[PDB]
Amino acid sequence: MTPPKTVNFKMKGVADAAFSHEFHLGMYKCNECHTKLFAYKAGAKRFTMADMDKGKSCGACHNGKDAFSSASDCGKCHPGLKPAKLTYKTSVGEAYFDHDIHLSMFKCADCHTKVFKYRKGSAPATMADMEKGKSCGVCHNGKDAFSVADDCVKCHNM
Numbered sequence: 598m599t600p601p602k603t604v605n606f607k608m609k610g611v612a613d614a615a616f617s618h619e620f621h622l623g624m625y626k627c628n629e630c631h632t633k634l635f636a637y638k639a640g641a642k643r644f645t646m647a648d649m650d651k652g653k654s655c656g657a658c659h660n661g662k663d664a665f666s667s668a669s670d671c672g673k674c675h676p677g678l679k680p681a682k683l684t685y686k687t688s689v690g691e692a693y694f695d696h697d698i699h700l701s702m703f704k705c706a707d708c709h710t711k712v713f714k715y716r717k718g719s720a721p722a723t724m725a726d727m728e729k730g731k732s733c734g735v736c737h738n739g740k741d742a743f744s745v746a747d748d749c750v751k752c753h754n755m
């Protein structure tokens with residue numbers, strides 16, 4: 598018999614999530630999660646990220662105190678939701694967006710989903726759009742973060 602295996606959560610329309618028994622077993626024993634938090638049966642009891650904020654499922658520990666909050670860092674549990682360096686193909690060459698640099702100042706919620714969706718290429722914007730406050734322009738306005746009005750080389754390889 599082998600230890601419980603890594604669990605895969607299949608969601609239609611959403612990037613799958615994963616749970617590592619091995620990693621958590623380095624900290625807990627079976628009864629700390631079974632059966633108050635999760636059952637031992639193949640019986641589903643599907644939860645939402647909301648239920649988690651309400652202390653259920655992964656949220657029982659991933660609350661910002663016991664373990665990192667399940668409200669952010671989606672890429673830690675959702676492999677497909679991993680923030681990466683983005684490259685845009687524009688009419689004047691490539692433009693880039695580095696998540697890592699921004700993650701040293703903001704949390705996922707600061708941009709997702711009010712400003713951007715977790716999907717590149719969704720709502721394309723022109724620099725003019727940005728100058729009016731859209732896309733990067735929401736912050737890069739020369740008052741909060743540096744403006745998009747000049748120093749194109751900051752984001753462009755022209």
Ligand code: HEC
Pocket residue numbers: 600601604616618621622625626627628629630631635636637638639640642
């Ligand atoms: C919380 C940190 C856990 C600890 C410690 C252990 N398990 Fe676990 N287990 C946990 C989760 C999040 C899940 C997924 C539940 C889901 O909604 O799909 C599981 C699943 C299992 C299963 C599979 C049962 C099934 O869904 O049909 C088994 C058989 C199981 N866990 C066994 C098990 C044992 C023996 C543990 C101690 C060695 C153990 N788990 C610890 C969360 C956690």
Ligand code: HEC
Pocket residue numbers: 606608611614615642643644645646647654655659666667668669670671672673674675678705
């Ligand atoms: C690990 C602690 C997680 C973090 C952090 C995030 N999510 Fe998650 N998500 C996780 C699991 C195990 C599941 C499935 C739970 C189940 O019982 O099946 C999910 C599910 C979702 C869903 C579908 C349900 C819903 O609330 O709509 C979505 C849309 C989803 N997760 C999105 C998401 C985002 C955007 C996150 C960061 C802001 C995020 N998750 C973090 C586990 C974890």
Ligand code: HEC
Pocket residue numbers: 614615616617620621624625629630634654655656657658659663664665673674
């Ligand atoms: C309490 C019994 C927990 C439950 C239930 C779940 N997790 Fe957990 N998780 C817990 C701790 C104490 C930690 C370590 C501290 C930290 O915040 O990192 C974690 C860590 C993880 C991680 C990151 C691991 C790493 O490489 O550092 C992930 C990806 C993770 N946990 C996912 C996860 C999911 C998907 C859960 C619900 C299915 C879940 N955890 C439950 C404590 C507990």
Ligand code: HEC
Pocket residue numbers: 669670671672677678679680681682683694696699700703704705706707708709713714715716717718719720721
């Ligand atoms: C604003 C400063 C951001 C923060 C903070 C985070 N993300 Fe992000 N993300 C941002 C942009 C501009 C885009 C492009 C959207 C578009 O319309 O093209 C994205 C895109 C993503 C995606 C999909 C592409 C990818 O990077 O793989 C994901 C999966 C994503 N972002 C995840 C993510 C997570 C988990 C964050 C916090 C840890 C996060 N983003 C923060 C801008 C910003």
Ligand code: HEC
Pocket residue numbers: 685687688689692693694720721722723724725732733737744745746747748749750751752753
């Ligand atoms: C980062 C803060 C930027 C600065 C500074 C400038 N641009 Fe930009 N530009 C950036 C991105 C990420 C994108 C793609 C946006 C998308 O939704 O796809 C672009 C795109 C353009 C485009 C194509 C779209 C259009 O406006 O027609 C052009 C022609 C362009 N950018 C030119 C440009 C010039 C000349 C700049 C300095 C005056 C400039 N950009 C700055 C991000 C950023």
Ligand code: HEC
Pocket residue numbers: 693694695698699702703707708712732733734735736737741742743751752
């Ligand atoms: C507010 C939530 C922001 C969004 C949305 C985007 N950026 Fe940003 N960016 C922001 C800050 C606060 C900073 C730090 C510097 C400052 O102006 O105070 C940055 C920094 C960058 C950089 C790197 C600058 C450097 O370290 O030299 C670049 C090139 C940049 N940002 C580009 C960029 C693009 C293309 C964005 C839209 C896809 C984007 N940022 C959104 C704040 C915010």
